[PDB]
Every structure is written in structure tokens, then in C-alpha cells.
Design a protein around this ligand. Structure first.
Ligand SMILES: Nc1ncnc2c1ncn2[C@@H]1O[C@H](COP(=O)(O)OP(=O)(O)O)[C@@H](O)[C@H]1O
Length: 342
């Protein structure tokens, strides 16, 4: 079949990093996040972060170092860049929310540029090294401090990653965000109780950022790290999206996903076409996949469930085998978790 049809080869050298950055900047400048003053705030943000997205820029050097660096998962340029773009979109939404909550005093340009610069540094930190050891994120932060001009916290030893960026455009530690709860005497070592800590607050923020954009994600970590508890805390605390835990098995097939859909979703006819939406209105059905990587590879190196999820993520829909009709996904998003593939 290889000799039965033509062929075109698209090497990774075809897509330079700079054209990707230009695509992101143009799309951010033109299309709005909500669906306009907030288009204006997008334009101001893009003007601020333009110098850092040029050739031989901060992001390019950080990305090539992260490629020189090591990660738990197979590092891909486009994965990191998509994470960075989504979380910068969330930063723009944060500025919009701050402006809405302060109608009298709009977000001024100097504070805006300081906040955007610091957030973008924090974004590289938590997106390029988001899947590595703490010492290795520390090396990445050290390199960024060496190469960047953006002001950084003056902590003698504490890494930049522990710090967060306030809506006021200042470097603030995540420690002050950690409360001090006192669990009941009869709830000691209870499964449901979640003691806030330094990692819990940061992962809560990351999950909120990456779930507001409805961008699917999978958590990775050694057994016992409580990834499920960390996700479930954010999911229950997040107001209007139901949680449907799904323990994937080695013999899982997309038939299980279809069964879960028909259990929690219904098929309705819309003028665009058949659209899948959760039965309960105003709810973003979040399908938690307990073990995303555990279903087996075929003899041809394909996991059918993961291919199915990829199909519905990239096309924004899937094909119903009952009538061979295109079905779009509405108010549906996915989260998974998995121990390291090693
Ligand atoms: N915020 C927290 N507060 C209290 N205990 C925690 C917290 N985060 C993790 N743990 C501990 O980590 C352990 C991991 O739970 P586990 O059953 O391994 O879940 P997972 O399958 O997600 O790893 C829990 O038993 C819990 O005691």
C-alpha cells in the first residue's frame, strides 16, 4: 500500500518555532476568548509579550534547554507550546476578571506589562518543566534567571517555581496561600480529607487554569502521590461541572466511553447536526480516566481508547457508529491520570 499511492513527507523542520509563535500571536490578537474591550486587552498583552516570542527569544532558548532537559513523559515541542498558549489565555482572562471586579480603576499599562512578564516567566517554568523532578525544575529556573531580564524574586535559595504572581503584578510566595486547617479527631487519615500544602495550592491553580480553557490534561506521578485526590479536590470545589470517575482497565475499549456517554449524556438534533450534551444543564461533564495509559497497545502500536479520545479532542466531536453521523461534543471535557510509563 505504500507503493500503491503517492507520498509527501513533513519533517519537524517544516514547522519552525517562530511560525508557531506567530500563529499563536495572530490568533490571540484576532479571535476573542469568550467567543470588544477584552479583544483590546488581548492586543495589549500580545504587544507586551511580542519581544519574548521572537527568534532567539527567551521562550525559544527555554524550550531548547527543556529539550536538552529530561521529562517523565515524552517531550514534544507542540505539547509545551500549547500548554503555554492556553495558560497565557488564562492569564488574559485573569486580567479581564480583575478589570471587571475593579470597574472604577482599569488595569493600567505599566502594571499590566509587569504582570504579563512575570506570568510569562512563571508560565515557562510551570509548562516546560511541568513534568519533571523538582531539582530539574530548579535547574530550568536557574537557567531562566541567568538568561532573562524580567525581575525575579530575591530568595537566596527558594526556587522561582514556589513563587506565584499576584493580580497586582508582584512576586508573592505560594506559602501565604496555604491555610492551616484542623481536621476532626474521627477523620484522621480519612480518604476524603485533603490537608492543604505547598504542592496542593499550586496544583489547584494549574488545574483551574487548564480546566477553565477546557483543555484536557493527564496527571503523572509515582504511586501514592495522591494524584486522584488532588484532582478530585479541584473538581468538587469547581462549581458547575460533574465528575464521572472511570477506572480504565487493560482491556478497555471505546465502547466503555460510549456506555458512559449514553449513561450521562443524550443525543439531540441541532441545526448544525447531532450534538452530544450532558442531560443536566449548565454542567461540564468531566470524564476522569483513572489509568489513561494502562489499556494495551495493539500489535500495530495503537491504543484504541486513546485514539478515540484524540479524535474527539482534535475534531471536537466523534462519529456515531449507529447511523454513521458526525456528533459534536458540547459541555464535555476529559481529565486522566497515570503512573509513569517506565
Ligand atoms: N493534601 C493531602 N492531605 C492529606 N493527605 C494527603 C494529601 N495529599 C496526599 N495525601 C496522602 O497521599 C496518599 C495517596 O493516596 P492514594 O490512595 O495513593 O491515591 P492515588 O491513587 O491518587 O495515589 C493518601 O493516603 C494521603 O494520605
Amino acid at each position: 500500500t505504500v507503493s500503491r499511492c503517492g507520498m509527501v513527507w513533513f519533517s519537524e523542520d517544516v514547522l519552525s518555532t517562530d511560525m508557531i509563535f506567530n500563529n499563536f500571536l495572530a490568533r490571540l490578537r484576532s479571535i476573542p476568548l469568550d467567543e470588544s474591550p477584552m479583544l483590546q486587552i488581548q492586543r495589549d498583552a500580545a504587544t507586551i509579550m511580542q519581544p519574548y516570542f521572537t527568534s532567539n527569544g527567551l521562550v525559544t532558548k527555554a524550550l531548547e534547554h527543556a529539550f536538552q532537559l529530561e521529562h517523565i513523559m515524552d517531550l514534544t515541542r507542540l505539547r509545551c507550546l500549547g500548554s503555554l498558549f492556553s495558560m497565557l489565555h488564562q492569564a488574559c482572562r485573569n486580567v479581564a476578571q480583575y478589570n471587571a471586579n475593579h470597574p472604577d480603576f482599569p488595569m493600567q499599562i505599566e502594571q499590566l506589562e509587569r504582570y504579563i512578564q512575570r506570568y510569562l516567566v512563571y508560565a515557562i517554568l510551570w509548562s516546560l518543566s511541568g513534568d519533571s523532578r523538582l531539582k530539574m525544575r530548579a535547574e530550568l529556573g536557574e537557567y531562566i534567571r541567568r538568561i532573562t531580564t524580567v525581575p525575579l524574586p530575591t530568595a537566596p535559595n527558594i526556587p522561582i517555581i514556589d513563587y506565584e504572581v499576584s493580580i497586582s503584578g508582584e512576586w508573592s510566595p505560594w506559602q501565604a496561600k496555604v491555610p492551616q486547617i484542623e481536621v476532626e479527631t474521627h477523620k484522621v487519615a480519612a480518604p476524603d480529607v485533603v490537608v492543604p500544602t505547598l504542592d496542593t495550592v499550586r496544583h489547584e491553580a494549574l488545574l483551574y487554569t487548564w480546566l477553565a480553557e477546557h483543555k484536557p490534561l493527564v496527571l503523572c506521578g509515582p504511586p501514592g502521590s495522591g494524584k486522584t485526590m488532588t484532582l478530585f479536590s479541584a473538581l468538587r470545589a469547581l462549581p458547575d461541572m460533574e465528575v464521572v470517575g472511570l477506572n480504565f482497565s487493560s482491556a478497555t475499549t471505546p465502547e466503555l466511553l460510549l456506555k458512559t456517554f449514553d449513561h450521562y449524556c443524550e443525543y439531540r438534533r441541532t441545526p448544525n447536526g447531532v450534538v452530544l450534551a450532558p442531560v443536566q444543564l449548565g454542567k461540564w461533564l468531566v470524564l476522569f480516566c483513572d489509568e489513561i495509559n494502562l489499556p494495551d497497545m495493539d500489535k500495530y502500536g495503537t491504543q484504541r481508547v486513546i485514539s478515540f479520545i484524540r479524535q474527539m479532542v482534535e475534531h471536537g466531536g466523534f462519529y456515531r457508529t449507529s447511523d454513521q453521523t458526525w456528533v459534536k461534543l458540547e459541555r464535555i471535557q476529559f481529565v486522566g491520570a497515570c503512573n509513569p510509563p517506565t
